[PDB]
């Protein structure tokens, strides 16, 4: 008891400092950054806000609970106040409440007091200049609080932050003028709590009412604030719309646009994983392997944790349907390994041309196939076994009888033996010629050609268009 009682005081001072000065220096600094320059944006405290939010998402967040200075909620949410020279007095009132909190119990517990608190900024009337400061002062307690998952009486409080964000959405439909430089930070912050829309709604069932609401927000941002807005909202669309049918494959067709410019960073890569599974549902394997590889290869630096391992998991799925895959056991991480353990023997069965080896993988690992969600291609891969199996043996064997190859091709009658190779040439597999009497399959090859034209002529536009973009970057980054 004395140890646990005296170890309570040490923890709070760290949130009492960094959690106090995180939105004070970044938010209060963004106030001066929003008064002028305001180029672009930039508003570098918006990306610094991303660093602080992602910092809280690990440790320590804020709420909890935690029974440490719950008076931080009324601190920033009250006392604009009101015009800038009067706000300076309230800038001293934060220090006044620092002394009040340094004297008495400092209101270490709020809970049901969030009802007057969250409505106090509406009692001030008003900030009135910066809506992102009002939305952030209310959300910063509540957004990390969603990670508690208590599911009692505070879920509707998260919904109240969603209503405050809807007031941020109506103000996202009006001003401007003309030229809002704070709406990019509103795109950032709202995309977060739009994913908190996803989490809080997913506590019970699908959000479908918010699918028409997201389409209302996604379309009302057109065309003005779509920049960096439409990208995050399209992932908010694509993610759960990939979980719930339907039509998103043809919906993103008419939705594009592209939509440029890609922001922010890994956002477009993860979008190419989301739409990567989409474009993989059309089964064209050149665009699917390029969108899946570009999804993972374009994402630094992690941690955390396993969904960046999931894009790598589903990445080589289209490579399994290509007919040739390397053994990936050397790419296993300490985490991704234990997650894909069935998928290991799966791609090992894809390398081999044995049917029973692949079918036993299906019967045993079908439970993990339910966990991943990819099924339909597991039964049709038997056609990849007959095409890779015939690619194997044909190129392999000098002249193979249709009765001897019939074991690995499982039928290979005297009739279909013609089509196996012939319709493989239709798919561009093997050139083997067969004169059918008994018969026997005599595989030869003569090709000397290509390896030339498209690679070098495309490399011209590749390199040139690249260095042109690198011009568009460097030439435009010299403002300082």
């Amino acid at each position: 008891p004395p140890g646990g009682g005296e170890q309570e005081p040490p923890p709070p001072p760290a949130p009492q400092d960094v959690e106090m000065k995180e939105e004070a220096a970044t938010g209060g600094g963004s106030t001066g950054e929003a008064d002028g320059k305001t180029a672009a944006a930039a508003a570098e405290h918006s990306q610094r806000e991303l660093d602080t939010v992602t910092l809280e998402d690990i440790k320590e967040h804020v709420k909890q609970l935690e029974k440490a200075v719950s008076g931080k909620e009324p601190r920033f949410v009250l006392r604009a106040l009101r015009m800038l020279p009067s706000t300076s007095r309230r800038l001293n009132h934060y220090v006044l409440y620092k002394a009040v909190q340094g004297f008495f119990t400092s209101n270490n517990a709020t809970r049901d007091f969030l009802l007057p608190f969250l409505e106090e900024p509406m009692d001030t009337e008003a900030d009135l200049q910066f809506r992102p400061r009002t939305g952030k002062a209310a959300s910063t307690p509540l957004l990390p609080e969603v990670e508690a998952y208590l599911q009692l009486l505070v879920v509707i409080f998260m919904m109240n932050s969603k209503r405050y964000k809807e007031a941020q959405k109506i103000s996202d439909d009006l001003m401007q003028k003309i030229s809002t430089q704070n709406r990019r930070a509103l795109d950032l912050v709202a995309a977060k709590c739009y994913y908190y829309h996803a989490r809080v709604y997913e506590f019970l069932d699908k959000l479908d009412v918010v699918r028409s609401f997201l389409h209302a927000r996604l379309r009302t941002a057109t065309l003005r604030h779509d920049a960096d807005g439409q990208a995050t909202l399209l992932n908010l669309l694509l993610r759960n719309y990939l979980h719930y049918s339907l039509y998103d494959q043809a919906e993103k067709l008419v939705s594009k646009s592209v939509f440029p410019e890609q922001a922010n960073n890994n956002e477009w890569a993860r979008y190419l994983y989301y739409t990567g599974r989409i474009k993989a549902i059309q089964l064209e394997y050149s665009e699917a392997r390029r969108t899946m590889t570009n999804a993972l290869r374009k994402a630094p630096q992690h941690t955390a944790v396993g969904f960046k391992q999931t894009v790598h998991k589903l990445l080589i799925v289209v490579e399994l349907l290509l007919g040739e895959i390397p053994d990936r056991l050397q790419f296993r991480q300490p985490s991704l390994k234990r997650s894909l353990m069935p998928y290991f023997l799966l791609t090992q069965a894809v390398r081999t041309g044995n049917l029973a080896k692949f079918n036993q993988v299906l019967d045993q690992f079908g439970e993990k196939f339910q966990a991943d969600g990819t099924y339909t291609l597991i039964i049709r891969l038997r056609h990849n076994v007959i095409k890779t199996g015939v690619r194997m043996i044909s190129l392999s064997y000098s002249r193979i009888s249709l009765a001897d190859i019939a074991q690995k091709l499982q039928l290979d009658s005297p009739e279909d033996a013609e089509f196996i190779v012939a319709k493989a040439i239709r798919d561009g597999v093997i050139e083997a010629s067969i004169n059918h009497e008994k018969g026997y399959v005599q595989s030869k090859e003569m090709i000397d050609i290509y390896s030339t034209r498209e690679p070098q002529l495309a490399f011209h536009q590749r390199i040139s268009f690249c260095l042109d973009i690198h011009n568009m970057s460097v030439k435009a980054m010299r403002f300082p």
Binding site: A40, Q176, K177, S179, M472, K475, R478, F479
Partner: protein, 48 residues
Amino acid sequence: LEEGKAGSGLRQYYLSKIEELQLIVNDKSQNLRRLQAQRNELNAKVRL
């Protein structure tokens, strides 16, 4: 007004998006002004 002053937010935004574009392209000239003046002073160096 909806025609309008709320519509002028979209109208002026077009010239704001092209402002940022032209601003981005303005810097594209600005640093090549530094390179132009670089080799221009170097042209004064070959004249020197």
